[PDB]
Amino acid sequence: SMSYTWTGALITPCAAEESKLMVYATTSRSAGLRQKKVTFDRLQVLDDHYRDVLKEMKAKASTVKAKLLSVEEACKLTPPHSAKSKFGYGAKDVRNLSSKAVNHIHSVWKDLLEDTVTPIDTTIMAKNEVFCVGRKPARLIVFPDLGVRVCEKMALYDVVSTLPQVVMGSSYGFQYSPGQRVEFLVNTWKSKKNPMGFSYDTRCFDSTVTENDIRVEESIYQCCDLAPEARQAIKSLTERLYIGGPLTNSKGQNCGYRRCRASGVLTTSCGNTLTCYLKASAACRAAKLQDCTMLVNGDDLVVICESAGTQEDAASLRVFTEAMTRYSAPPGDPPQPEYDLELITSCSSNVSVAHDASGKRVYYLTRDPTTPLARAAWETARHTPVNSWLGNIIMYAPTLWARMILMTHFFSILLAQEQLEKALDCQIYGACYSIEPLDLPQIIERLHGLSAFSLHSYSPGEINRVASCLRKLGVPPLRVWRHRARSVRARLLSQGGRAATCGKYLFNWAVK
Numbered sequence: 416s417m418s419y420t421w422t423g424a425l426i427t428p429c430a431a432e433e434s435k436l437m438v439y440a441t442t443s444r445s446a447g448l449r450q451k452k453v454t455f456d457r458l459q460v461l462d463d464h465y466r467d468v469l470k471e472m473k474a475k476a477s478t479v480k481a482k483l484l485s486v487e488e489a490c491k492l493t494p495p496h497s498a499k500s501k502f503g504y505g506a507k508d509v510r511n512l513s514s515k516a517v518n519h520i521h522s523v524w525k526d527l528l529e530d531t532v533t534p535i536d537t538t539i540m541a542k543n544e545v546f547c548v549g550r551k552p553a554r555l556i557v558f559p560d561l562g563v564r565v566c567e568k569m570a571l572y573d574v575v576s577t578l579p580q581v582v583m584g585s586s587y588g589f590q591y592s593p594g595q596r597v598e599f600l601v602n603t604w605k606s607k608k609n610p611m612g613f614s615y616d617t618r619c620f621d622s623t624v625t626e627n628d629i630r631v632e633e634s635i636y637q638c639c640d641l642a643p644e645a646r647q648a649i650k651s652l653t654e655r656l657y658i659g660g661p662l663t664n665s666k667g668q669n670c671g672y673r674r675c676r677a678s679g680v681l682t683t684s685c686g687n688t689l690t691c692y693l694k695a696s697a698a699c700r701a702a703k704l705q706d707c708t709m710l711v712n713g714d715d716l717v718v719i720c721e722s723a724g725t726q727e728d729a730a731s732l733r734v735f736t737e738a739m740t741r742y743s744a745p746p747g748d749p750p751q752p753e754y755d756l757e758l759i760t761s762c763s764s765n766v767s768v769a770h771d772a773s774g775k776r777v778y779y780l781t782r783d784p785t786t787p788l789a790r791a792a793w794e795t796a797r798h799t800p801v802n803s804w805l806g807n808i809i810m811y812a813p814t815l816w817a818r819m820i821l822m823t824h825f826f827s828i829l830l831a832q833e834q835l836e837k838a839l840d841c842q843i844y845g846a847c848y849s850i851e852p853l854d855l856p857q858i859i860e861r862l863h864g865l866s867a868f869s870l871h872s873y874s875p876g877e878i879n880r881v882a883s884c885l886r887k888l889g890v891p892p893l894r895v896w897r898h899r900a901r902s903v904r905a906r907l908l909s910q911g912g913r914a915a916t917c918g919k920y921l922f923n924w925a926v927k
């Protein structure tokens with residue numbers, strides 16, 4: 416059946432958008448191009464590999480016990496900036512246990528227990544994301560009302576935060592920090608006698624997810640030891656929200672129908688991950704890949720295995736891709752075999768090497784600096800909820816490009832404007848922090864270790880990538896950034912106390 420049906424009505428904005436300040440942002444104006452790409456008929460033929468894998472997943476999920484969150488708990492874990500409800504309350508009311516929000520949530524819950532059929536309304540919107548130079552359309556976000564989003568947490572928060580790591584073990588990508596991800600990948604690579612690996616990424620993964628996939632996910636969740644009420648709500652949520660439902664735009668008009676994965680529900684990330692893991696493990700078996708190890712974050716997959724030779728590997732990946740296509744998930748680009756860990760890119764990121772103070776080799780996670788640089792450029796002009804600059808400084812703090820350019824530029828703009836002690840909002844790992852720039856040294860030490868302030872002798876490929884990137888975007892080269900940073904460091908050190916600590920740790924690399 417069709418991933419989507421459309422009525423004719425447009426996907427409309429809810430606010431003042433802006434598609435430029437080179438660097439652009441996606442808007443609702445481009446939503447029609449996205450609608451085209453994500454609209455198609457799915458075909459799926461399962462086989463005994465798929466079935467054998469699923470059976471093993473269920474046997475693991477059957478050892479998981481999960482509880483209901485109370486309304487109260489679910490209210491307290493609602494994110495502070497999520498969309499206000501149609502029925503008269505917002506995120507802030509939910510979190511402060513307003514009687515209006517609580518009585519309406521209890522009523523949504525009771526309706527889920529009592530009605531297991533009526534499709535549930537979702538709003539469709541175009542996501543506003545900054546990119547770099549061609550132009551890609553806006554991604555679509557599809558979410559139900561806030562009261563339903565609280566009930567999803569009641570039914571499933573304990574399941575989605577416990578089950579996946581038990582079912583997928585070390586392949587569950589979301590349990591790792593960047594350093595931990597690197598350690599998994601490097602250890603896996605070094606365990607093979609002749610390592611080969613590849614990344615796979617599915618072409619419109621949300622749209623490839625079928626009704627059967629979503630029902631299979633529910634059946635995994637029902638292997639858990641759950642309270643009766645939980646089982647009924649999870650079934651009712653599966654039938655009324657997860658498999659499909661109607662879409663309505665920001666102006667309350669009927670946009671169409673969805674018969675595929677919603678991007679804006681609690682189970683999206685866990686479901687996608689479980690479903691990809693299931694099809695990818697089955698596809699490794701069809702392909703007959705030797706000593707296979709997988710890392711999965713949504714539909715981003717790395718596989719690392721024993722090479723069987725050059726032409727053998729190339730053919731084996733074709734058989735893998737064929738199997739994945741039969742299971743409903745063709746790739747955006749065909750996967751390529753790699754014999755260098757550094758060349759495998761997934762979740763937009765890759766492993767690279769540098770040296771610590773003692774001269775020990777140290778592996779760290781990096782990425783192409785183009786999009787992060789563009790995004791930080793945008794937040795120099797405008798101002799966001801997410802502060803992607805700061806998040807990137809935190810997650811990629813050991814990288815050459817974050818230390819030399821991102822850290823430098825932003826502590827300079829902060830000295831200039833005297834905003835050192837002003838806290839900034841910052842979305843990292845699905846949660847919104849209030850970050851004080853002088854807190855960074857401690858945050859980076861906690862996330863990456865002290866070696867992050869001390870790494871040198873980076874790999875020549877990484878240095879050249881940063882350098883080509885600066886040149887392509889019009890930003891000063893690295894010699895300029897070393898000079899500026901000597902200046903920024905000097906100032907911070909004059910300011911004493913905590914700002915002196917920033918200068919000492921964050922810019923120790925600039926000293927002569």
Ligand SMILES: CN1CCC[C@@H](CN(C)C(=O)Cn2c(-c3ccccc3)c(C3CCCCC3)c3ccc(C(=O)O)cc32)C1
Pocket residue numbers: 438788789790791792795820821824825888889890891
């Ligand atoms: C004539 N030339 C210099 C003045 C204005 C400039 C406009 N451009 C292309 C930029 O500003 C590019 N750019 C950009 C930039 C612009 C667009 C996309 C990506 C980076 C940045 C970002 C780098 C990372 C921190 C955030 C600013 C930037 C920083 C400093 C400087 C600088 O010249 O000192 C330039 C930077 C063009």
Ligand SMILES: [Mn+2]
Pocket residue numbers: 616617618619620714747
């Ligand atoms: Mn994809």
Ligand SMILES: [Mn+2]
Pocket residue numbers: 616617713714715
């Ligand atoms: Mn992906």
